[PDB]
Amino acid sequence: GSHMIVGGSTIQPERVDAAALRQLGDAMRKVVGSADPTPLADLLSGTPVDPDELTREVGADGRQALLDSGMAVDDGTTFSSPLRGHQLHGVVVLSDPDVEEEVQHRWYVDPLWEADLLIRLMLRRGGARALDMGCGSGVLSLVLADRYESVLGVDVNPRAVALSRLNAALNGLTNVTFREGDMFEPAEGRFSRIVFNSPTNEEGNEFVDLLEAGEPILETFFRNVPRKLESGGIVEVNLAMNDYPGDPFRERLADWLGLTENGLRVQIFTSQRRATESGGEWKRGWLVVAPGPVGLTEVEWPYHDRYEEDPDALLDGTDRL
Template structure:
């Protein structure tokens, strides 16, 4: 009978280790040769673009997968967390791959069954190891895999070249490995030494040699140092628990987000960027109030890229999904979390990536800086670092224009990533045109519906005429003021650019 939950090894294994970088790279290559890549896995498990296999669906996945080939055996061991018979492993998995798996301590025997000691998940061109999904309970140092917030942080990071970079609260090391592709040197820190062991293994598995790991809490391992780029995925969840280091800070309310936001500017060299995931008790009358307060006197400019606002029940539900197959424990957790939010007077929680830029030497570094809040669409994020950098540059250029008249005298053009599409509907015996939509093909997934006058303005903004000339042609003198405001908003979110 197939298990209904992932089955951890009989004892908790240590994190995998690389015999050498060469051996780890060969292991990754052999896994890919066996089909251990996202497209093949999605096809085998019918998961679409998701690889987040959850235990309630495990029986379905196992029946779809079978156990008759090499990839099926590997997926059972390292994605679904299900043991296989030793004879089956030896029959279907080539000896060289078995040797490399054993050398990395990724296999453990238990009375004729073989367990995988880690979860291995492909992410684009990377392969990332973490603790098995079913082995978290009772282990505060559990190392989580790559979750949606990790992906969002990667997409919203402003990247450069040859930076000295920091991955704060590195976890399994995914951000550090991504930074290593363009940074000259990356420091990855975490209070969880088990996580740093995984980060070290993942760096070797992905042939990355310029990541240095340091153990310690928050800023302690890098005190007094400066970096050109910082990313941080701290345990920002507003939680009553101290169950998991990756989720629960043990600090009251949103104090951990405040700690990281207030401390990060001191790590930044002039002109450097930082991207920090945060959560906070949100005031509906001024949603950005608390992050704005935390940045006072920081010497940083910032965009608060607001990804979602949840009520307490939504938050409690999201962060306790691992208990879904245990109804009593799940119900108890929800009650405990809701009581905590009630005690703190929290009615809404905000989630965002706060992107900071340290003011450089050519500007007044003692000034408070500015912070703008943007509500991101619910659409799936995609790589947007260049777009985020452009938001800062556009804000700077608008600040340099000291009047509406100055903006009216500038040439504006629609960015190359912009696309206008139109839906048509068959009605009354003929096709009828409906709403026009302006959207961006790359970067932040903004879109906007266009009324006729706005559509005309977009067509006029091709960089050949000033904004004043385009407004006169598109909307006329009576609506020029409204059109100016619209053009400014389109600039601020990246639909337009200044000449």
């Protein structure tokens, strides 16, 4: 048909018993991320697999649970999966494979481009109630679930809600809730923790799709953050920022947050930057709202480079700062 097919597959965990899902999840903990792929690990890496082999490893029920949830598809001979398995930070996560923009369905889910990294940037603290805006595959929500009494994930992509729910089910996590909706609209009450791996990269002000929504989505997030955040609470945001001549991002951010009016402390840790036509600058960085002296600070923290060199060096970094 048309070429934008990756990310349109039907995902339906509610079609399977939660016990079957937690068993499949247990099979996945054994083999996903381990070299010399078993049948199940190779299925979750995108290779066609004989169901005979797959059956010996997860059972006949496990084999049906893969088909009924949509984790696998029966060609005729073999089984294939439209998703990819990951195992990190104590959790097992499925998501779409990493592929080029041009073959991305409008419901394509973040293939975990920065999730492992952002999880290492996250303050290791815990508390009452966490929110994960744009939760995608649910990966950030599943991690936070370990140190928060409850976690709410929100995404406007109904495929990502289904996938998030599947992944929670695979890990047998019971304190995680996902809702479909537009930004804060289904997030009732306040939160002691808010995390946002934002849909922003090189699109500037332009809305391109659900993964690159333009600066307007950041303005909405940050304008509404003060009424969503508990006193003493913590916001963390992965984002792309654009500085234009006489028009720096950090100032637009201050207005959105009502920085002085709300008494907020905001630090931006900038990791990558490149000059643009307009004479201004593109940045990628990590923004944290946390308690302390009212104001906005910006530092250079090349955490993308230090990640390539030694990932565990990033643990408790924002705490040290």
